[PDB]
Design a binder for this molecule. Sequence first.
Ligand SMILES: COc1ccc(S(=O)(=O)N2CCCCCC2)cc1NC(=O)Cc1n[nH]c(=O)c2ccccc12
Ligand SMILES: COc1ccc(S(=O)(=O)N2CCCCCC2)cc1NC(=O)Cc1n[nH]c(=O)c2ccccc12
Ligand SMILES: [Cl-]
Ligand SMILES: [Cl-]
Ligand SMILES: [Cl-]
Ligand SMILES: [Cl-]
Ligand SMILES: [Cl-]
Lengths: 440, 447, 452, 448
Amino acid sequence: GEVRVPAKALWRAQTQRAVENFPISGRGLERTQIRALGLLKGACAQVNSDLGLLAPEKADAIIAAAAEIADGQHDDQFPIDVFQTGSGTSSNMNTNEVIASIAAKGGVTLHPNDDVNMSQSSNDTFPTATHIAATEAAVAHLIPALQQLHDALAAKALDWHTVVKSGRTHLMDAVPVTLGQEFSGYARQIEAGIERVRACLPRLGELAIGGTAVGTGLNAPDDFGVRVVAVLVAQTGLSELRTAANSFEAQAARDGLVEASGALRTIAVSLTKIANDIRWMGSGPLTGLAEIQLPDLKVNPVLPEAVTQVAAQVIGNDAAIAWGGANGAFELNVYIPMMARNILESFKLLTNVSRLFAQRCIAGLTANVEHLRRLAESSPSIVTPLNSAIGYEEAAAVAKQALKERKTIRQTVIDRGLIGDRLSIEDLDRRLDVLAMAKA
Amino acid sequence: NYRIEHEVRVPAKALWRAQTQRAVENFPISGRGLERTQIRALGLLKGACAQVNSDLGLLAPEKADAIIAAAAEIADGQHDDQFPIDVFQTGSGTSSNMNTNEVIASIAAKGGVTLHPNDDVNMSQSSNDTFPTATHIAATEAAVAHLIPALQQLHDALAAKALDWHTVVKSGRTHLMDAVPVTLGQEFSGYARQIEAGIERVRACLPRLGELAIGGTAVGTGLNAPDDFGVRVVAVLVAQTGLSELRTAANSFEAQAARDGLVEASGALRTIAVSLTKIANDIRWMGSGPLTGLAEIQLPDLQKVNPVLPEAVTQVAAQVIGNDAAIAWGGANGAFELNVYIPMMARNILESFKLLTNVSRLFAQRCIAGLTANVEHLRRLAESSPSIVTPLNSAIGYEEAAAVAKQALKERKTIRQTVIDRGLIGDRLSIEDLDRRLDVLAMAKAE
Amino acid sequence: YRIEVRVPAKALWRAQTQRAVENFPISGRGLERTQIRALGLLKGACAQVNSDLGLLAPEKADAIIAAAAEIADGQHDDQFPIDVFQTGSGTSSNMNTNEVIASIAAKGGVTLHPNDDVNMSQSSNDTFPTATHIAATEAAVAHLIPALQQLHDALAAKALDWHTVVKSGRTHLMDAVPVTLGQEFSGYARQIEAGIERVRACLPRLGELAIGGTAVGTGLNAPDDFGVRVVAVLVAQTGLSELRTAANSFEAQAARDGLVEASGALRTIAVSLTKIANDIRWMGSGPLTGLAEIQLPDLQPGSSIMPGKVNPVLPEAVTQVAAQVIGNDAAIAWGGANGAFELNVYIPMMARNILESFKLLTNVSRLFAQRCIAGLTANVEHLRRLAESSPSIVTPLNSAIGYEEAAAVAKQALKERKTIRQTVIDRGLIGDRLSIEDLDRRLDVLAMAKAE
Amino acid sequence: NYRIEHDTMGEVRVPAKALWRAQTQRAVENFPISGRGLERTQIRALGLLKGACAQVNSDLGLLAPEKADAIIAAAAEIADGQHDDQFPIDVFQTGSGTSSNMNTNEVIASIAAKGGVTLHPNDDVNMSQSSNDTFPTATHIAATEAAVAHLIPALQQLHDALAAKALDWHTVVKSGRTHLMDAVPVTLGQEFSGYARQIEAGIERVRACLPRLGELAIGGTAVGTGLNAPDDFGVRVVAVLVAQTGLSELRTAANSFEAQAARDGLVEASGALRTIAVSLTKIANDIRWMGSGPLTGLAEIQLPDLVNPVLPEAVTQVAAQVIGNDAAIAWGGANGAFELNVYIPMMARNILESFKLLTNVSRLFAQRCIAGLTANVEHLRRLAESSPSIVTPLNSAIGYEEAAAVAKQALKERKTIRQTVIDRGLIGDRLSIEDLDRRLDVLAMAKA
Ligand SMILES: COc1ccc(S(=O)(=O)N2CCCCCC2)cc1NC(=O)Cc1n[nH]c(=O)c2ccccc12
Ligand SMILES: COc1ccc(S(=O)(=O)N2CCCCCC2)cc1NC(=O)Cc1n[nH]c(=O)c2ccccc12
Ligand SMILES: [Cl-]
Ligand SMILES: [Cl-]
Ligand SMILES: [Cl-]
Ligand SMILES: [Cl-]
Ligand SMILES: [Cl-]
């Protein structure tokens, strides 16, 4: 039919039809997705050239246009809604048409399908770009952001190694701990988060390229996949990219995204705990716990709120990803654009809020040392450290009398006239010292 | 060009000011800000508040008119690009509240009127009762003015097909296996009811979705606001918008300590997403083929035909389900006098409303309306199914009925032709008695 | 062990049930008492109607009704061994009920055919979802709503008792202007009251029964009015007026959207309960290192290592129940979306989850009301002291001494740990623009909470 | 019919025959919520842990040898399943699992008393322990054992059944399906190789979570600090557990505070199970669709009758349950505070159920569905040979327009592409039979 296309638009007919067919969310591909589609087209053009299937002049043109796209020079040339044909074929064609128009600016005539989509199908390209984008997000961005947060938490764990305070279990007063020990716990949660992301990489980095329409590789060179992956690894430095173990699994399912989402969700769960504890420690200053002071951006914990909200989003996104993941049929899972949107957003949210959390909250925390000490000196104590001085039986009697008369262990020892040759006052304070009780 | 404020650097053509710019620098998290409906509702709210402060003599009429004019521009969508703050901001949404106050002041300034963002545009209000008020305004309007009419359009399209296909007999399917006859019209009457029930579900949540916190100020007590600020602002909002569903909260503390009304409404959207998944799935399966699939109907071409709108629908449904999980999560985790997950909740609920509205109209117009049934083929299959030999039992015994069914399937013939081919027509069974027993439309029991 | 297939001797079920037992050894958990009861109610009403329409012999119908009444009464809850994770229509549990009823009638000398007699006018597809919705409707009206009303009433009572118990508000977990403990609990009460409203609003669709639609929704091989007749009997016998024939017989079998809808209501209540329970254990936190606003009744020892430590175990039970309801809700929506054509085949899993959510919420709400809320005591003097020392209450001084001096009062009081009243005095601001009488009027914290 | 018992809170009436005591009975009355208690595997883990603890306490000279022996013997009876009816406490108990810990202590004491040995539930049976490190330890022992000894071998059985079908059906060519629409040829073998990979990847996912799932909190006592335990109590107890269970995946926690303030390892493991549920949903759905009919469906295969696809229905319902449980687990996981996460019994219920359901349904799926599948081989090939999707390799010979006409006529007349090309008289000018049979070899097209 007749198709009206904007003057300064590098996309063509089929992209414009897709724009008209899916006015649903008003939001299109992110920069990372666009970049990954550009990287893939350049790599495909390179391999088609190396195999003598594509004329060198045409290949050079594609590679040049693809490089512009991957460098972010055309992020306004991808107007198709996220909620499109579930294979992502519309965005694939979007990329083919934009490259064709760019090449035409350089006096080379490309056919979007026959040249720019050579050896590819409408079904193995978009999930490939999706996993490229997800792997890049995991390796180049999320993991270093998490490492930064870990290092900030670990720094406080060391700095506060002897800042004694009261433990809390069930929200109730418990035996002493140090602020440093608590932050050593938070740091380990983030460290384990990094371990979780790393563990999913062998399957997250699997690319479907080469499988063409249904996974068989019909109408592609037998080694298209492995050659394209090699160019991608060389150009991105992403050694985690690899050919799929099974070309049918790689298109019929998107289980790699579901798996990876689970790692992000676990991280969201840890971050909720860490953020929650931190805003509670900062609460008050009169009606709260008043354990620490957060940097001001009466200070509201705005970054913990940002963190806990991001975590909520990752959990919602995770549910959406799994839902689409389960609902593939036969040779193709047709939930890819929705799954891509959600997994890449979860990566982006976690990355950016972890860095903000680290730099503008954690690094600048100040402990209220004297208040914390007074809290520790209000914790329950135990009789065990008195055994080698008064014996198991007298200790047991002290514990019973303390419980009965609702007095501290220390005062009960004094009231029972136990301060003598077997136990001086100094010896009592040493054995019951709250920092020693924390076993730091 | 960038103008300077105090020190913070603000874009020249930006109508926001220093507090918004600081929020921009503090939350570079998603790169996504408030949606159009939330911005519109913030405008609506600020205008109504100014009207009431003017009515109560608390704000100069010249200042009030400036806010009202500015706010109207915002509510009309003229300033959507003036709200740069990330969704993932302070959990009260105070940053976006100040964004609105600042943009209104800057709009007024161009008209020669000076407004203090806090002292004037935020008069009688707090950082805590305004943003969720705007959220519930935006959600109520999305439910009443957009989603319900969209759903009604879908219902009517499905109902129209159910009528057109009233006598289009086909094989029923249970457990995906062949079963006794139904009509395509009956199936589509079921789809229509699912959507109709969806509308009932949305309507049922409105008494609580429409509750507004405005007037409760910082903690719910209404301290530093007129005692009747809430009912006055709501009456102005209703008067201006026609949204009679908007109401003052039943309890002012519940309305700020929790966002339970959004959790409730999301559940209604989630159920609709569940209904749409079933409908969309059946339709793309019915259209599967053209050779190795079910080949019951043909879908209209768009991009044989891929079912691209059922894929759009089932992907939207997945998103609504994910959004629903995030909303419940934020909803459960308020503390004492304030739930601090509102911007995240607003984002997700308003998007869910939008996606369902837009994809339902698309589904109705560009998929449902142009569906075409393979009528003769559907009847042929129904008339050849082993599932329909049971009315033959009283005439020929279930053992011979079984032989008929097995031979019909093997030779790919109707049950009728098989009965005839096996020489069963006689005094035990006339051809007219056979056609009565095997009347597959009558078996469907269409009203 | 009798033989038919080896079947336990004291088993009232027969061969088809025993086959299902051997086919689905998956969870080791079978139907609940409420589902069993509902299957009993339905079979008895069906025989009643079949008899009335002259389709079933009176002696046979009487034997079904008598046997089905024993099942509904809970006398045979050990005769339903089939796993929850069975054929997705629930046909196996339907046959279970048919077989057990036939065996009961056999003890009385009457021979019933499980299919031809007990399952007359019914199919293996409209029975189990009918029983599920009967069970879910009963759980909503007879058990959950009264239990929520009991918790509502306990919260409302506390709100009344604590109407003048002033304290500092908390927003973002930071100090805020005064509220009363009573206002907060009126807020919790409203959340529970709204929860009841949410359950009530789903009942028009939760109560829809598929019975009469037979195999595919068409009503083939059943009387045309079978559905309305069975429902009439059920409503008369159970008093459950919310039970009704489905608006659309195809929707009622192709989907279980009413269950998804109802779970949404339950999920929302779980969300409310989470907020309420969290606030309450935080309010009782400490007693020396926490908020120490209230004291929860002691229910059991908390720690071996810490002998006097008593933990908020009911709020912990409530919040864990809430997590379960949210999990169950996701399972129900998952099952609900994935029907195909004429039948949703996730009914037993959806039934398990919705009925569990009803049960857990019902039971934990009553325990929460009786063993926690009713016995709460407020630390009134503690709460009032913090309120009277709060920087947040200096605002009403503005019109007398100016906001800059009020800010100074707040800073000094906060630093010298004094009340706002005493700090105003210690700065010598009581003169001819401000009496001690006017000061106490302006710093009346209860009046600042504006309690009605 | 009762006897009097007591704790630090006062006196409590207990059923006369019951092996539990006061604190258990308080919890019986405090939490009548679900009506369901700990599972066999949980009780076993608690028994194993208590025995190991008594062994270490005896080794370190902290507990009298005659007392340790009485504990170890009692704990063995519990771990073997002789006293499961003595664990009446609801899943929905105190969030630390305090009550079930005391349950185990009390029952061990009452058992030993029958042997003439007097044990204090707290002082002897709970020596060097607290609830806060024992109940999550038992929970992670149960989950680790469920992963290693049960789930992975069940998945390997399912993988092997799917891989056997992939081998058997290696040349069973059929029409591909994308968007539910006919596509270029594949084989049943290839589809099933895809299913096998999903389950193989599932095993990889479970194995990848084990370094953290296997972490045990034991030794951290009340708040993570180890107060009131020997400094090496944890490593010693873990060594005993590893020796007695053969589970090398059991290990001390990398950080003692993380191990009690959080249950992130359970959230992580649930993610793997959830992913498996997602894979199983795809496989089960495909298989019931392939078996659909016998007239109006796809009718690609026939499922064994045990014909409704009842095992795929059991599989997809189990999947839904696992996804549901997964949401409950993450919810509890996120909501710890300071030194302790208090959602452990609920998280344990859900993670352990998810392990159990996937284990049992995978073995059933493998044995009683996958193994007995039969393919309609000739019919599949005939459809593949008759599909408009395979006319494309004729384009260069007969042209686009004629290829479309061939496709349309073949469908309308229900004939193969090969026969339609012949019938339209295209052999001779356009191409030979040899060329036709080469271009339309659907098996070669499937690249198999
Ligand atoms: C999706 O399903 C189809 C797609 C296309 C065509 S066709 O009309 O194009 N066709 C019929 C002409 C004889 C050559 C086979 C191809 C037919 C069917 N369906 C059937 O053939 C049903 C059937 N009937 N009888 C049997 O014995 C049987 C045995 C195994 C599998 C299926 C069947
Ligand atoms: C599930 O799908 C089937 C089930 C059973 C049988 S059967 O083998 O039992 N059969 C074929 C013999 C002629 C009488 C129809 C019944 C066939 C099909 N499939 C087809 O007939 C495919 C088909 N082929 N060609 C067309 O032109 C057409 C037009 C509309 C719809 C479908 C088609
Ligand atoms: Cl443009
Ligand atoms: Cl701008
Ligand atoms: Cl029995
Ligand atoms: Cl039972
Ligand atoms: Cl009614």
